[PDB]
Structure 1
Protein backbone atom coordinates (compact mmCIF):
# COMPACT_ATOMS: atom_id res chain seq x y z
CA UNK A 1 0.00 0.00 0.00
CA UNK A 2 2.82 2.45 -0.83
CA UNK A 3 2.68 4.88 -3.76
CA UNK A 4 2.93 3.04 -7.09
CA UNK A 5 6.34 3.69 -8.75
CA UNK A 6 6.28 3.62 -12.55
CA UNK A 7 9.38 3.71 -14.79
CA UNK A 8 8.89 5.48 -18.13
CA UNK A 9 11.66 4.98 -20.69
CA UNK A 10 12.62 6.24 -24.12
CA UNK A 11 15.91 5.68 -25.96
CA UNK A 12 16.61 9.22 -27.22
CA UNK A 13 16.03 12.60 -25.55
CA UNK A 14 13.51 13.36 -28.32
CA UNK A 15 11.38 10.38 -27.22
CA UNK A 16 11.05 11.68 -23.64
CA UNK A 17 10.63 15.44 -24.39
CA UNK A 18 6.91 14.95 -25.16
CA UNK A 19 6.54 12.66 -22.14
CA UNK A 20 7.87 15.30 -19.73
CA UNK A 21 5.73 17.98 -21.41
CA UNK A 22 2.52 15.94 -21.43
CA UNK A 23 2.65 14.94 -17.74
CA UNK A 24 3.11 18.64 -16.98
CA UNK A 25 4.42 18.13 -13.44
CA UNK A 26 7.59 19.28 -11.72
CA UNK A 27 10.44 16.78 -11.98
CA UNK A 28 13.55 16.40 -9.80
CA UNK A 29 16.58 15.52 -11.97
CA UNK A 30 18.72 12.76 -10.46
CA UNK A 31 21.95 11.70 -12.19
CA UNK A 32 23.05 8.03 -11.94
CA UNK A 33 25.17 5.75 -14.16
CA UNK A 34 25.34 8.27 -17.03
CA UNK A 35 21.58 8.81 -17.16
CA UNK A 36 19.37 11.59 -15.82
CA UNK A 37 16.22 10.35 -14.08
CA UNK A 38 13.27 12.75 -13.86
CA UNK A 39 11.26 11.99 -10.72
CA UNK A 40 7.75 13.42 -10.31
CA UNK A 41 4.36 12.81 -8.72
CA UNK A 42 1.24 12.29 -10.83
CA UNK A 43 -2.17 11.07 -9.44
CA UNK A 44 -0.95 8.97 -6.42
CA UNK A 45 1.92 7.62 -8.56
CA UNK A 46 5.59 8.37 -8.56
CA UNK A 47 6.81 8.52 -12.16
CA UNK A 48 10.50 8.15 -13.04
CA UNK A 49 11.27 9.19 -16.64
CA UNK A 50 14.56 8.76 -18.49
CA UNK A 51 16.09 8.29 -21.89
CA UNK A 52 18.61 5.45 -21.94
CA UNK A 53 20.66 6.52 -24.97
CA UNK A 54 20.62 4.37 -28.10
CA UNK A 55 20.93 0.60 -28.32
CA UNK A 56 20.93 -2.58 -26.30
CA UNK A 57 23.67 -1.96 -23.73
CA UNK A 58 22.44 1.57 -22.92
CA UNK A 59 18.82 0.44 -22.53
CA UNK A 60 19.76 -2.62 -20.46
CA UNK A 61 21.74 -0.44 -18.05
CA UNK A 62 19.03 2.20 -17.63
CA UNK A 63 16.23 -0.34 -17.12
CA UNK A 64 18.35 -2.11 -14.46
CA UNK A 65 18.98 1.25 -12.74
CA UNK A 66 15.26 2.06 -12.77
CA UNK A 67 14.47 -1.22 -11.06
CA UNK A 68 17.33 -1.41 -8.52
CA UNK A 69 17.91 2.26 -7.72
CA UNK A 70 14.41 3.75 -8.13
CA UNK A 71 12.32 0.72 -7.13
CA UNK A 72 9.92 0.90 -10.07
CA UNK A 73 7.13 -1.71 -10.05
CA UNK A 74 6.25 -1.36 -13.76
CA UNK A 75 8.16 -0.16 -16.82
CA UNK A 76 6.50 1.49 -19.83
CA UNK A 77 8.61 2.18 -22.91
CA UNK A 78 7.68 4.84 -25.47
CA UNK A 79 9.50 5.73 -28.69
CA UNK A 80 9.71 5.27 -32.42
CA UNK A 81 10.41 2.30 -34.72
CA UNK A 82 10.91 1.19 -38.29
CA UNK A 83 8.02 -0.63 -39.98
CA UNK A 84 8.64 -4.06 -41.48
CA UNK A 85 5.10 -4.61 -42.81
CA UNK A 86 2.94 -2.80 -45.40
CA UNK A 87 0.03 -2.19 -42.99
CA UNK A 88 2.22 -0.36 -40.43
CA UNK A 89 2.55 3.16 -41.79
CA UNK A 90 4.32 6.30 -40.57
CA UNK A 91 2.79 7.45 -37.25
CA UNK A 92 0.98 4.14 -36.58
CA UNK A 93 1.16 2.80 -33.04
CA UNK A 94 2.26 -0.72 -32.15
CA UNK A 95 2.33 -2.55 -28.83
CA UNK A 96 4.97 -5.32 -28.71
CA UNK A 97 3.60 -8.68 -27.68
CA UNK A 98 6.99 -10.38 -27.91
CA UNK A 99 10.45 -9.09 -28.67
CA UNK A 100 13.62 -10.64 -30.02
CA UNK A 101 17.30 -9.70 -30.19
CA UNK A 102 17.55 -10.10 -33.94
CA UNK A 103 21.34 -9.77 -34.13
CA UNK A 104 22.18 -12.60 -31.72
CA UNK A 105 24.02 -15.40 -33.54
CA UNK A 106 25.17 -18.57 -31.79
CA UNK A 107 24.51 -20.67 -34.91
CA UNK A 108 28.09 -22.03 -34.67
CA UNK A 109 26.67 -24.26 -31.88
CA UNK A 110 23.45 -25.02 -33.84
CA UNK A 111 21.36 -22.56 -31.85
CA UNK A 112 18.59 -20.80 -33.75
CA UNK A 113 19.22 -17.14 -34.46
CA UNK A 114 18.14 -14.91 -31.55
CA UNK A 115 18.68 -17.66 -28.96
CA UNK A 116 21.10 -17.55 -26.02
CA UNK A 117 21.50 -20.43 -23.55
CA UNK A 118 19.58 -19.88 -20.31
CA UNK A 119 17.22 -17.52 -22.16
CA UNK A 120 14.78 -17.69 -25.10
CA UNK A 121 14.38 -16.28 -28.59
CA UNK A 122 11.19 -14.39 -27.72
CA UNK A 123 10.74 -12.25 -24.62
CA UNK A 124 7.16 -11.60 -23.46
CA UNK A 125 5.72 -8.35 -22.22
CA UNK A 126 2.90 -7.97 -19.67
CA UNK A 127 -0.44 -9.42 -20.75
CA UNK A 128 -2.32 -7.26 -18.26
CA UNK A 129 -0.67 -4.07 -19.55
CA UNK A 130 -1.09 -5.07 -23.19
CA UNK A 131 -4.80 -5.75 -22.49
CA UNK A 132 -5.09 -2.28 -20.93
CA UNK A 133 -3.46 -0.73 -24.01
CA UNK A 134 -5.93 -2.51 -26.29
CA UNK A 135 -8.90 -1.54 -24.11
CA UNK A 136 -7.91 2.14 -24.13
CA UNK A 137 -7.21 2.14 -27.88
CA UNK A 138 -10.64 0.64 -28.59
CA UNK A 139 -12.34 3.24 -26.35
CA UNK A 140 -10.46 6.15 -28.00
CA UNK A 141 -10.89 4.77 -31.55
CA UNK A 142 -7.13 4.62 -31.99
CA UNK A 143 -5.74 2.04 -34.34
CA UNK A 144 -3.31 0.11 -32.16
CA UNK A 145 -1.53 -2.74 -33.81
CA UNK A 146 0.23 -5.52 -32.01
CA UNK A 147 3.08 -7.77 -32.99
CA UNK A 148 6.64 -8.92 -32.63
CA UNK A 149 9.34 -6.25 -32.39
CA UNK A 150 12.90 -7.05 -33.38
CA UNK A 151 15.69 -5.18 -31.58
CA UNK A 152 19.38 -5.04 -32.46
CA UNK A 153 22.37 -2.72 -32.41
CA UNK A 154 22.03 -1.69 -36.08
CA UNK A 155 19.81 0.95 -37.69
CA UNK A 156 18.06 -1.11 -40.37
CA UNK A 157 17.94 0.56 -43.79
CA UNK A 158 17.86 -2.21 -46.39
CA UNK A 159 15.31 -4.42 -48.10
CA UNK A 160 17.50 -7.46 -47.43
CA UNK A 161 17.68 -6.98 -43.66
CA UNK A 162 13.93 -6.14 -43.43
CA UNK A 163 13.06 -9.35 -45.21
CA UNK A 164 15.33 -11.37 -42.91
CA UNK A 165 13.54 -9.96 -39.86
CA UNK A 166 10.15 -10.93 -41.28
CA UNK A 167 11.23 -14.40 -42.45
CA UNK A 168 13.26 -15.30 -39.34
CA UNK A 169 11.20 -13.75 -36.54
CA UNK A 170 7.85 -12.75 -38.09
CA UNK A 171 8.64 -9.26 -36.77
CA UNK A 172 6.38 -6.28 -37.52
CA UNK A 173 8.74 -3.48 -36.47
CA UNK A 174 12.42 -2.88 -35.75
CA UNK A 175 14.22 -0.81 -33.15
CA UNK A 176 17.29 -0.95 -30.90
CA UNK A 177 16.04 -1.21 -27.30
CA UNK A 178 12.70 -2.92 -26.75
CA UNK A 179 13.96 -6.46 -26.38
CA UNK A 180 16.65 -5.45 -23.88
CA UNK A 181 14.17 -3.39 -21.80
CA UNK A 182 11.64 -6.25 -21.82
CA UNK A 183 14.40 -8.75 -21.03
CA UNK A 184 15.58 -6.86 -17.94
CA UNK A 185 11.98 -6.55 -16.73
CA UNK A 186 11.42 -10.29 -17.18
CA UNK A 187 14.60 -11.08 -15.16
CA UNK A 188 13.38 -8.92 -12.22
CA UNK A 189 9.70 -9.93 -12.51
CA UNK A 190 8.66 -6.37 -13.36
CA UNK A 191 5.65 -5.85 -15.67
CA UNK A 192 6.70 -4.23 -18.95
CA UNK A 193 4.84 -2.69 -21.91
CA UNK A 194 6.67 -1.55 -25.05
CA UNK A 195 4.95 1.07 -27.26
CA UNK A 196 6.36 2.31 -30.56
CA UNK A 197 5.17 4.70 -33.25
CA UNK A 198 6.46 4.21 -36.78
CA UNK A 199 9.05 6.77 -37.98
CA UNK A 200 10.28 5.06 -41.16
CA UNK A 201 10.11 1.89 -43.27
CA UNK A 202 13.55 0.48 -42.39
CA UNK A 203 14.59 0.72 -46.05
CA UNK A 204 17.15 2.72 -48.03
CA UNK A 205 15.29 6.02 -47.23
CA UNK A 206 14.88 5.25 -43.52
CA UNK A 207 17.47 7.73 -42.26
CA UNK A 208 15.75 10.66 -43.98
CA UNK A 209 12.29 9.48 -42.92
CA UNK A 210 13.47 9.06 -39.34
CA UNK A 211 14.86 12.60 -39.17
CA UNK A 212 11.60 13.98 -40.62
CA UNK A 213 9.17 12.07 -38.38
CA UNK A 214 11.00 11.50 -35.07
CA UNK A 215 9.22 14.42 -33.33
CA UNK A 216 5.70 13.58 -34.50
CA UNK A 217 6.02 9.82 -34.00
CA UNK A 218 7.61 10.32 -30.54
CA UNK A 219 4.67 12.51 -29.55
CA UNK A 220 2.09 9.99 -30.81
CA UNK A 221 3.68 7.28 -28.68
CA UNK A 222 4.06 9.58 -25.67
CA UNK A 223 0.40 10.63 -25.75
CA UNK A 224 -0.67 6.99 -25.75
CA UNK A 225 1.72 6.14 -22.92
CA UNK A 226 0.24 8.96 -20.84
CA UNK A 227 -3.29 7.64 -21.49
CA UNK A 228 -2.13 4.27 -20.07
CA UNK A 229 -0.61 5.85 -16.95
CA UNK A 230 -3.95 7.67 -16.43
CA UNK A 231 -5.58 4.22 -15.93
CA UNK A 232 -2.91 2.69 -13.64
Structure 2
Protein backbone atom coordinates (compact mmCIF):
# COMPACT_ATOMS: atom_id res chain seq x y z
CA UNK A 1 0.00 0.00 0.00
CA UNK A 2 0.95 3.65 -0.49
CA UNK A 3 2.94 5.33 2.30
CA UNK A 4 0.81 8.22 3.62
CA UNK A 5 2.01 11.40 5.31
CA UNK A 6 -0.41 13.30 7.52
CA UNK A 7 0.73 16.80 8.41
CA UNK A 8 -0.65 19.61 10.57
CA UNK A 9 0.92 22.79 11.96
CA UNK A 10 0.13 22.60 15.68
CA UNK A 11 -0.02 19.81 18.25
CA UNK A 12 -3.81 20.43 18.52
CA UNK A 13 -4.16 19.45 14.86
CA UNK A 14 -2.27 16.11 15.09
CA UNK A 15 -2.66 14.90 18.72
CA UNK A 16 -6.24 13.71 18.02
CA UNK A 17 -4.78 11.29 15.43
CA UNK A 18 -2.03 10.14 17.80
CA UNK A 19 -4.65 9.43 20.48
CA UNK A 20 -6.80 7.42 18.04
CA UNK A 21 -3.76 5.44 16.81
CA UNK A 22 -2.55 4.83 20.42
CA UNK A 23 0.57 2.91 19.26
CA UNK A 24 3.34 4.63 17.30
CA UNK A 25 7.12 5.13 17.13
CA UNK A 26 8.55 8.63 17.70
CA UNK A 27 11.68 9.73 15.81
CA UNK A 28 13.43 13.04 16.43
CA UNK A 29 14.52 14.70 13.16
CA UNK A 30 14.71 18.25 11.72
CA UNK A 31 14.23 19.77 15.20
CA UNK A 32 10.86 18.04 15.50
CA UNK A 33 9.21 14.66 16.12
CA UNK A 34 7.94 12.41 13.29
CA UNK A 35 5.50 9.66 14.25
CA UNK A 36 5.30 6.28 12.53
CA UNK A 37 2.19 4.18 12.84
CA UNK A 38 0.12 1.53 11.13
CA UNK A 39 -3.61 2.32 10.80
CA UNK A 40 -5.94 -0.34 9.39
CA UNK A 41 -2.83 -1.76 7.67
CA UNK A 42 -1.77 1.59 6.13
CA UNK A 43 1.74 2.84 6.92
CA UNK A 44 1.62 6.46 8.14
CA UNK A 45 4.11 9.17 8.95
CA UNK A 46 2.61 12.04 10.98
CA UNK A 47 3.91 15.34 12.32
CA UNK A 48 2.95 18.83 13.29
CA UNK A 49 5.35 21.21 11.56
CA UNK A 50 5.14 24.21 13.89
CA UNK A 51 3.48 27.35 12.61
CA UNK A 52 4.04 28.99 9.23
CA UNK A 53 5.44 28.67 5.76
CA UNK A 54 9.07 27.78 6.45
CA UNK A 55 8.26 25.20 9.15
CA UNK A 56 5.57 23.52 7.03
CA UNK A 57 7.77 23.52 3.90
CA UNK A 58 10.56 21.82 5.84
CA UNK A 59 8.19 19.17 7.27
CA UNK A 60 6.63 18.33 3.89
CA UNK A 61 10.11 18.04 2.37
CA UNK A 62 11.29 15.78 5.23
CA UNK A 63 8.22 13.53 4.98
CA UNK A 64 8.81 13.02 1.24
CA UNK A 65 12.60 13.34 0.66
CA UNK A 66 13.77 11.64 3.88
CA UNK A 67 10.90 9.30 4.79
CA UNK A 68 9.54 8.52 1.29
CA UNK A 69 5.89 9.47 1.75
CA UNK A 70 3.95 8.90 -1.51
CA UNK A 71 0.77 10.87 -0.71
CA UNK A 72 0.34 13.78 1.74
CA UNK A 73 -2.84 14.84 3.52
CA UNK A 74 -2.79 18.14 5.41
CA UNK A 75 -5.19 18.56 8.35
CA UNK A 76 -5.85 21.59 10.53
CA UNK A 77 -7.89 24.74 11.07
CA UNK A 78 -8.30 28.01 9.15
CA UNK A 79 -9.74 31.51 9.18
CA UNK A 80 -12.95 31.80 7.17
CA UNK A 81 -13.27 34.48 4.47
CA UNK A 82 -16.32 33.22 2.55
CA UNK A 83 -19.44 34.57 4.35
CA UNK A 84 -21.18 31.18 3.96
CA UNK A 85 -18.57 29.45 6.14
CA UNK A 86 -19.25 28.96 9.84
CA UNK A 87 -16.96 27.84 12.63
CA UNK A 88 -16.40 24.08 12.35
CA UNK A 89 -17.13 23.92 8.61
CA UNK A 90 -14.76 21.86 6.45
CA UNK A 91 -13.13 23.29 3.35
CA UNK A 92 -10.73 21.51 1.00
CA UNK A 93 -8.48 23.66 -1.19
CA UNK A 94 -8.74 23.25 -4.95
CA UNK A 95 -5.82 25.65 -5.27
CA UNK A 96 -3.73 27.91 -3.02
CA UNK A 97 -1.67 31.09 -3.25
CA UNK A 98 0.89 32.87 -1.04
CA UNK A 99 -0.69 36.31 -0.47
CA UNK A 100 2.42 37.73 1.22
CA UNK A 101 4.94 36.79 -1.50
CA UNK A 102 5.47 40.25 -2.95
CA UNK A 103 7.98 41.29 -5.62
CA UNK A 104 5.37 43.54 -7.24
CA UNK A 105 8.01 46.33 -7.37
CA UNK A 106 9.30 44.58 -10.53
CA UNK A 107 5.85 44.38 -12.20
CA UNK A 108 5.05 40.82 -11.09
CA UNK A 109 1.56 40.10 -9.78
CA UNK A 110 1.11 39.61 -6.03
CA UNK A 111 1.95 36.03 -5.07
CA UNK A 112 4.21 35.43 -8.08
CA UNK A 113 7.89 34.72 -8.42
CA UNK A 114 9.57 33.62 -11.68
CA UNK A 115 9.59 29.85 -12.19
CA UNK A 116 6.45 29.22 -10.10
CA UNK A 117 2.69 29.71 -10.38
CA UNK A 118 0.48 32.17 -8.52
CA UNK A 119 -1.80 29.22 -7.61
CA UNK A 120 -0.71 25.67 -6.75
CA UNK A 121 -3.33 22.96 -7.37
CA UNK A 122 -4.10 19.98 -5.14
CA UNK A 123 -4.64 16.45 -6.44
CA UNK A 124 -7.90 15.82 -8.32
CA UNK A 125 -8.18 12.14 -7.39
CA UNK A 126 -7.69 12.90 -3.66
CA UNK A 127 -10.26 15.70 -3.83
CA UNK A 128 -12.78 13.30 -5.43
CA UNK A 129 -12.02 10.74 -2.72
CA UNK A 130 -12.83 13.41 -0.11
CA UNK A 131 -16.17 14.08 -1.82
CA UNK A 132 -16.92 10.32 -1.63
CA UNK A 133 -16.05 10.23 2.10
CA UNK A 134 -18.22 13.31 2.76
CA UNK A 135 -21.18 11.66 1.01
CA UNK A 136 -20.59 8.31 2.84
CA UNK A 137 -20.38 9.89 6.29
CA UNK A 138 -22.98 12.64 5.67
CA UNK A 139 -20.45 15.40 6.40
CA UNK A 140 -20.81 18.81 4.72
CA UNK A 141 -17.71 19.63 2.65
CA UNK A 142 -16.97 22.78 0.65
CA UNK A 143 -14.36 23.28 -2.10
CA UNK A 144 -12.51 26.59 -2.27
CA UNK A 145 -9.37 28.65 -2.71
CA UNK A 146 -7.07 29.05 0.30
CA UNK A 147 -4.71 32.03 0.71
CA UNK A 148 -1.57 31.31 2.73
CA UNK A 149 0.82 33.73 4.43
CA UNK A 150 2.90 34.16 7.59
CA UNK A 151 0.41 36.35 9.48
CA UNK A 152 -2.46 35.46 11.77
CA UNK A 153 -5.21 37.52 10.09
CA UNK A 154 -7.54 39.35 12.47
CA UNK A 155 -8.32 42.45 10.43
CA UNK A 156 -11.39 42.93 8.23
CA UNK A 157 -9.51 45.17 5.77
CA UNK A 158 -6.68 42.64 5.26
CA UNK A 159 -9.23 39.86 4.89
CA UNK A 160 -11.15 41.93 2.32
CA UNK A 161 -8.03 42.71 0.28
CA UNK A 162 -6.78 39.11 0.22
CA UNK A 163 -10.26 37.81 -0.65
CA UNK A 164 -10.53 40.32 -3.51
CA UNK A 165 -7.11 39.62 -5.04
CA UNK A 166 -7.16 35.81 -4.88
CA UNK A 167 -10.92 35.00 -4.59
CA UNK A 168 -9.88 33.20 -1.40
CA UNK A 169 -12.42 31.42 0.81
CA UNK A 170 -10.14 31.06 3.83
CA UNK A 171 -6.67 31.88 5.11
CA UNK A 172 -3.98 29.94 6.94
CA UNK A 173 -0.16 29.84 7.29
CA UNK A 174 0.93 26.49 5.77
CA UNK A 175 -1.24 25.18 2.89
CA UNK A 176 0.28 26.84 -0.15
CA UNK A 177 3.82 26.04 1.02
CA UNK A 178 2.97 22.37 1.65
CA UNK A 179 1.15 22.14 -1.71
CA UNK A 180 4.16 23.69 -3.47
CA UNK A 181 6.52 21.09 -1.96
CA UNK A 182 4.22 18.23 -2.93
CA UNK A 183 3.76 19.53 -6.48
CA UNK A 184 7.54 19.96 -6.89
CA UNK A 185 8.24 16.43 -5.62
CA UNK A 186 5.40 14.85 -7.67
CA UNK A 187 3.44 13.70 -4.61
CA UNK A 188 -0.38 14.00 -4.61
CA UNK A 189 -1.51 16.53 -1.99
CA UNK A 190 -4.84 17.13 -0.23
CA UNK A 191 -5.33 20.22 1.97
CA UNK A 192 -8.23 20.13 4.49
CA UNK A 193 -9.16 22.89 6.92
CA UNK A 194 -11.90 23.23 9.54
CA UNK A 195 -12.82 26.83 10.34
CA UNK A 196 -11.69 28.04 13.80
CA UNK A 197 -12.54 31.76 13.35
CA UNK A 198 -13.57 34.39 10.80
CA UNK A 199 -10.24 36.23 10.50
CA UNK A 200 -11.68 39.60 11.60
CA UNK A 201 -11.87 41.57 14.82
CA UNK A 202 -11.30 39.32 17.86
CA UNK A 203 -10.36 36.33 15.65
CA UNK A 204 -7.65 35.36 18.18
CA UNK A 205 -10.37 34.79 20.81
CA UNK A 206 -12.41 32.57 18.47
CA UNK A 207 -9.27 30.68 17.44
CA UNK A 208 -8.43 29.92 21.10
CA UNK A 209 -12.06 28.88 21.82
CA UNK A 210 -12.56 26.64 18.77
CA UNK A 211 -9.15 25.31 17.67
CA UNK A 212 -9.35 22.10 19.70
CA UNK A 213 -12.74 21.02 18.39
CA UNK A 214 -12.32 22.20 14.80
CA UNK A 215 -8.94 20.41 14.69
CA UNK A 216 -10.65 17.14 15.72
CA UNK A 217 -13.19 17.45 12.88
CA UNK A 218 -10.53 17.83 10.19
CA UNK A 219 -8.35 15.11 11.78
CA UNK A 220 -11.16 12.56 11.82
CA UNK A 221 -11.97 13.26 8.17
CA UNK A 222 -8.41 12.71 6.94
CA UNK A 223 -8.17 9.46 8.90
CA UNK A 224 -11.34 8.26 7.15
CA UNK A 225 -9.77 9.18 3.78
CA UNK A 226 -6.77 6.97 4.64
CA UNK A 227 -9.14 3.99 4.65
CA UNK A 228 -9.83 4.57 0.91
CA UNK A 229 -6.10 4.87 -0.02
Interval of TM-score (by shorter of Structure 1 and Structure 2): over 0.9
Comparing 138-147 and 60-69, the one that deviates more? 138-147
Counterpart residue number, 1:89:
86
What does the per-residue CA deviation read over 1:10-56, in whole Å, with 9 as the maximum and x for residues that have no partner? 0001100111122x241100011111000011233210010000000
Counterpart residue number, 1:168:
165
- 1:28 paired with 2:28, answer no
Matches within 5 A, 1:113-128: 113-128=110-125
- Deviation of 1:139 after TM superposition, in Å, equals 2.1
- Deviation of 1:205 after TM superposition, in Å, equals 1.0
Cα distance in 2, alignment partners of residues 145 and 42 from structure 1: 26
What does the per-residue CA deviation read over 1:57-82, in whole Å, with 9 as the maximum and x for residues that have no partner? 00000100000111000000000000
Cα distance in 1, alignment partners of residues 15 and 26 from structure 2: 14
What does the per-residue CA deviation read over 1:185-208, in whole Å, with 9 as the maximum and x for residues that have no partner? 000000000000000000011000
Matches within 5 A, 1:11-50: 11-22=9-20, 24-50=21-47
- 1:213 paired with 2:210, answer yes
Cα distance in 1, alignment partners of residues 74 and 17 from structure 2: 11
Cα distance in 1, alignment partners of residues 101 and 38 from structure 2: 39
Counterpart residue number, 2:4:
6
Counterpart residue number, 1:78:
75
Cα distance in 2, alignment partners of residues 117 and 158 from structure 1: 30
Residue 25 of structure 1 contacts residue 41 of structure 1 at CA under 8 Å; is this kept in 2?
Answer: no
- 1:142 paired with 2:139, answer yes
Q: Under a length normalisation based on structure 2, what TM-score does the superposition of the two structures give?
A: 0.98
What does the per-residue CA deviation read over 1:201-229, in whole Å, with 9 as the maximum and x for residues that have no partner? 00011000000001000000001111101
Which ranges in structure 1 are unaligned for 5 or more consecutive residues? none
Residue 101 of structure 1 contacts residue 150 of structure 1 at CA under 8 Å; is this kept in 2?
Answer: yes
Runs of 4 or more consecutive aligned structure 1 residues displaced over 4 Å after TM superposition: none
SS at match of 1:95: strand
Counterpart residue number, 2:184:
187
Which ranges in structure 2 are unaligned for 5 or more consecutive residues? none
Cα distance in 1, alignment partners of residues 162 and 81 from structure 2: 8
Cα distance in 2, alignment partners of residues 92 and 193 from structure 1: 17
Residue 25 of structure 1 contacts residue 42 of structure 1 at CA under 8 Å; is this kept in 2?
Answer: no
Counterpart residue number, 1:201:
198
What is the total number of aligned residue pairs between the two structures? 229
